[PDB]
Design a protein around this ligand. Structure first.
Ligand SMILES: Nc1ncnc2c1ncn2[C@@H]1O[C@H](COP(=O)(O)OP(=O)(O)NP(=O)(O)O)[C@@H](O)[C@H]1O
Length: 297
């Protein structure tokens, strides 16, 4: 059949009565917990703690959107109290973590793994926008929200802010949330989200993969550096040298032209004009080889 009906308790224990040394982090609608299941499976679970109904959309999503580069929901928990969402635990955690951390001294993401990540994730997003009945606007595209499987393939996760369109091509009016780093200018400006605001987010996601930096960082301010990742990088055209901009942890890897390629893509996706941004399928194409050299003026 599919779609697992769970009973709070039989997942309090799976989370070892939940809290404490089981917190992968404070989520968007509560907290994320790593538990097991009776048979064996590592799951991560979302717990809610106090309008919304944001829950029921994340639940019947499964029934409208499935794809190997999209986190598949394992199951949920209702209860006339608070509610829960259970996704597979992801072997290698977020792209954020793998860049932001790591533990003891675990290794960094090499450049070709970063290229795969950009590709799969765009593939997952392209599918959301183009091959789903109501189109699905994700609304939280960022490195923290791209998860990695055991083979380090990207899966797009956390569908907390996802919206179902229809409403033709444009527009989904709804209040601005997420963090400052990944919000499109028109979005904050006009309170409207759309596929092109995902594109912007995805293009900032790439800047993170390439630089290793957060999108909005006071530590850069602590210097004479831009608080805004995009701004910082555009310290490219001027001050020559990727080198300084490219993630220090890479040294060994990448060929100049490799990175320049991804950057152009990131740049194309974060243009202030939504109309000139690529569609994600165009993005995939370019990651796939088709039509980047001329995409710009
Ligand atoms: N299925 C999963 N497997 C492994 N780790 C997960 C899973 N789901 C979420 N996480 C982790 O939960 C931690 C918190 O992420 P999350 O709280 O969902 O993002 P967020 O709070 O909404 N945005 P941000 O503040 O930028 O982290 C992350 O560091 C993820 O690594």
């Amino acid at each position: 059949g599919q779609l697992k009906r769970f009973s709070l308790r039989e997942l309090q224990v799976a989370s070892d009565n939940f809290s404490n040394k089981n917190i992968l982090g404070r989520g968007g609608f509560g907290k994320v917990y790593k538990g097991r299941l009776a048979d064996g499976t590592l799951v991560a679970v979302k717990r809610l703690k106090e309008g919304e109904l944001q829950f029921q959309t994340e639940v019947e999503m499964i029934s409208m959107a499935v794809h190997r580069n999209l986190l598949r929901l394992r199951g949920f928990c209702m209860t006339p109290t608070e509610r829960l969402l259970v996704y597979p635990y992801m072997a290698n955690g977020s792209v954020a973590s793998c860049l932001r951390e790591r533990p003891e001294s675990q290794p960094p993401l090499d450049w070709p793994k970063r290229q795969r990540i950009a590709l799969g994730s765009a593939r997952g997003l392209a599918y959301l926008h183009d091959h789903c009945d109501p189109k699905i606007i994700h609304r939280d595209v960022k490195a923290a929200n791209i998860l990695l499987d055991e083979e380090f393939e990207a899966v797009v996760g956390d569908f907390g802010l996802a919206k179902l369109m229809d409403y033709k091509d444009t527009h989904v009016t709804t209040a601005v949330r997420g963090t400052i780093g990944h919000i499109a200018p028109e979005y904050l400006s006009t309170g409207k989200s759309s596929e092109k605001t995902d594109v912007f987010g995805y293009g900032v996601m790439l800047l993170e993969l390439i630089t290793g930096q957060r999108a909005f960082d006071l530590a850069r301010l602590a210097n004479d550096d831009d608080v805004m990742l995009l701004d910082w990088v555009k310290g490219l055209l001027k001050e020559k040298k990727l080198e300084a901009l490219v993630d220090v942890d890479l040294q060994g890897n990448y060929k100049d032209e490799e990175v320049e390629q991804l950057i152009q893509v990131a740049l194309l996706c974060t243009q202030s004009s939504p109309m000139e941004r690529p569609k994600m399928s165009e993005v995939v194409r370019m990651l796939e080889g088709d039509g980047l050299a001329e995409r710009w003026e």
